[PDB]
Design a protein around this nucleic acid. Sequence first.
DNA 1: GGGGGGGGGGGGTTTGTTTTTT
DNA 2: GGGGGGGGGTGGG
Length: 843
Amino acid sequence: GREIGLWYAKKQGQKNKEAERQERAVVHMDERREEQIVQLLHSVATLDQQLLEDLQKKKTDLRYIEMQRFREKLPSYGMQKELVNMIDNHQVTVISGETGCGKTTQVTQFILDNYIERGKGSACRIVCTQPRRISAISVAERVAAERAESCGNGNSTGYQIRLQSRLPRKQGSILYCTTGIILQWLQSDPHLSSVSHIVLDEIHERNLQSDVLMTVVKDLLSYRPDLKVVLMSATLNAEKFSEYFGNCPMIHIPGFTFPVVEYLLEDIIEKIRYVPEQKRQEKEEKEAIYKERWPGYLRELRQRYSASTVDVVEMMDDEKVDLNLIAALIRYIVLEEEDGAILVFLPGWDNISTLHDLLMSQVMFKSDKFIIIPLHSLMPTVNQTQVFKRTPPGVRKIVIATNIAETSITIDDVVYVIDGGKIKETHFDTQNNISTMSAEWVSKANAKQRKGRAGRVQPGHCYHLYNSLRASLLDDYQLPEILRTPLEELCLQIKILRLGGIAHFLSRLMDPPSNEAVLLSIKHLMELNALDKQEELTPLGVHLARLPVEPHIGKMILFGALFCCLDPVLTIAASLSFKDPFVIPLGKEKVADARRKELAKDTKSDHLTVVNAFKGWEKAKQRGFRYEKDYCWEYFLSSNTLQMLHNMKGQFAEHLLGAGFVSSRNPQDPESNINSDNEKIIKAVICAGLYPKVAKIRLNLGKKRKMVKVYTKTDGVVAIHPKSVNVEQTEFNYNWLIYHLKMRTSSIYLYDCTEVSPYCLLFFGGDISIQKDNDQETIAVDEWIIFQSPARIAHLVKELRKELDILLQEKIESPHPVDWKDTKSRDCAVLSAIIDLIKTQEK
DNA sequence: GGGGGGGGGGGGTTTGTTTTTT
DNA sequence: GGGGGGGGGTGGG
């Protein structure tokens, strides 16, 4: 029976274990190095009236009158008498309005104008929070233009985002900022003084930072009775915020859009006459209802439509969008309907590429007229400003886009919208401690957001791709981001702001996270040694929290600063927290992967390719402006991302100087870059940063094609993502890898992986233990990472590791620049000598 | 692994967007 | 999963 399978399994496992035993890297330093280490171990106001006069003088400006001429047409002006008045009376108000009414650029101006005209115009300072950088810039610029002025330069409006700030004047004025700016402001002055009107906008998205800021405002309102907070949701479940804040008054601002008509799947199939080509938990409960009502619904539909439509709708796939239907719908729209610009929404790249190929396959979609512009976050400069250009008559511009286009693209020309009802979400599995990524049906808010892009300047049409039963059973809203994502950086943010009791505060959030996730995050932080035994923010924790990155990246930055390899480590840290400078165009994907491996050279690493690309870009910038563009074109780089990385490096160096680890704000000073030309030291520092993420690789010698299998301690058998450099590699000097991002899309995937030497794991690793498994005095760092070495060397390695740990604790607790020209604590020098030299195991 | 059979979705190369003082 | 086939056995019994 099943005994033969067990016999096969045992016979294979014995051989596999016997083959893996004789493939462990040997650890041995030298004859003289042992003597040196032994020796070292043995040695161990008129302004108020001025504002009114300026307003009166500007009231006669021709440009100001012209701006008022358009501003009068906005619906929100009709509520100006009310919107201000209640804001004057109540403390917290909720403003709900549909798309079309410019509440963002009107509500703030109403309060400012009322305060200025009333006389007490020097006692207000409105701070409005936006969820996107480009949105904040555009809103601030437009508001500045609306008052016949310019943003910043001491005017009455301005904005502030990361590394870009045009500040307005202190008294009066408006400041548009992202949520992170306010959350960082909360550290200096906890009560947020000198702010008279805090405005939270687009709060219905329910992102991570807005929820925290809203809770802080709610529990801060007790100590600041004179502070006014104004929330702007957008219809639908706008009563939830009012109930949460204590039944505050609400105002419903009417919208204004051109009429649009919605067609569902049955209407589309009936209209275009399309014949098909010949061939958890809660998610279950809804589906059950969709099953129970499935037959009866059809039993009605057969009387409202033809037989063929019912047959096509019944035999319909519910797990993937069919691109043949979209390709036929676009054909029908092109041939019959009038001029416009089709905009189709797709889940991801796998469908965008297929739809583009299907469209370009047909003969008519190849002439001068039709142009197809895919939109994605991994395409060059979102295909430039081609989408924003006005289409000459007789072209029928077609855009195939993921969700990028439903939030901030603003083509402002489309009239036909096609909505394949599928979106991609990134959940987080607490039991398996791995974040997943799946495709789920769009929510009602998502459907409304996609439909609202059609009618803005001209009446249009919206074509949804699901039947009425699925439309009626759609989720009201997407899951709040507070209930997905690890809560690790947030946990340190709670303690650095002294908000409360790390776990007590998280219970006051709207839709509080599950207790298991909080406990897991606290345990992970305790293991990382950032948090004390009783959650007291150990000295490493303060530096980790004050840095604007994840704790793992923060430790890498600190260790790179300690070991005098600041520049490449800072570049890697900057590129590990904000994208990467590589963009893959739609047509050419093999070429990009072939020219990225050339950048990788022979480092057998993924993080080192970013360093090489940045070094090449910096060397090319000095030559000239045209050379920079040529270099970015040849290697498929992005200039904007590289500039942002440069600014982030500057900010990190400034903070490190502020703490005291380094002696200059410049991240390329020659004093703190001694070990900057060695890749081994950089790899050791990276392994010190991202230690717990270590994967073993096994090369199955023979068996037709030589293949490498990657294993992890907990997550079974992972596989290297094809985008990584080491996807096709088969010759590894060391059989160990470290990674940063690991995701479960369909199978567990590592997105960036780099090999590490045994000495990089022995020192910056777990608890070293010495054993004897009938082979030698094998030394293990975590009981599963085993190396071969004699006992006399393993004992020295363990003692040196203990001394290094003590020295690093002392150095991190009290930072110092450290001088390499003296002999006070030379553990670091000996460790650098060991890592730089020796090694070369090639096993 | 392959195309036994449609046990289970354990595997079968890929790729929602977005954020941080002085 | 059983007990197709001996595809792997770090997929499970």
